[PDB]
Design a binder for this molecule. Structure first.
Ligand SMILES: Cc1cn([C@H]2C[C@H](OP(=O)(O)O)[C@@H](COP(=O)(O)O)O2)c(=O)[nH]c1=O
Ligand SMILES: [Ca+2]
Length: 129
């Protein structure tokens, strides 16, 4: 896989963000994770965590997987990086997202995220408290 440039347009919630990608506005949904909705427990904390991570970043990148690049709602499906740190993995490592929606052939980073979830579970963080 490879990282491509994007710029933040706007934070949305824990697992969606609006980025400009190849000069066009798009909503991205973060691969292989599920944050709580804003109206659910830890939803606001998840939203805040992703917002801080993407707004503070000097460089955002979007990394597509091998499979579909858009979902049925027209959202881009990617791993997103903020100054080289993966947002998807960071949300999981902090107990703010579960590994989820693992579809065949868009799952390159599955085991990396599962290792992060296991550690957030051990530390009984947030969702795992
Ligand atoms: C993360 C992800 C979500 N989706 C679809 C599945 C779910 O459909 P349904 O809307 O039919 O439940 C939905 C969950 O996204 P949200 O968690 O953003 O609601 O998005 C994909 O198709 N591919 C993906 O990789
Ligand atoms: Ca969600």
């Amino acid at each position: 896989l490879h990282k491509e440039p994007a710029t933040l347009i706007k934070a949305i919630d824990g697992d969606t963000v609006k980025l400009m990608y190849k000069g066009q506005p798009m909503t991205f949904r973060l691969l292989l994770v599920d944050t709580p909705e804003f109206n659910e427990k830890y939803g606001p904390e998840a939203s805040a965590f992703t917002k801080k991570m993407v707004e503070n970043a000097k460089k955002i990148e979007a990394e597509f997987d091998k499979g579909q690049r858009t979902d049925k709602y027209g959202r881009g499906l990617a791993y997103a990086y903020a100054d080289g740190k993966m947002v998807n993995e960071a949300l999981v490592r902090q107990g703010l997202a579960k590994v989820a929606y693992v579809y065949k052939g868009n799952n390159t980073h599955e085991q990396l995220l599962r290792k992060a979830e296991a550690q957030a579970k051990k530390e009984k963080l947030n969702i795992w408290s």
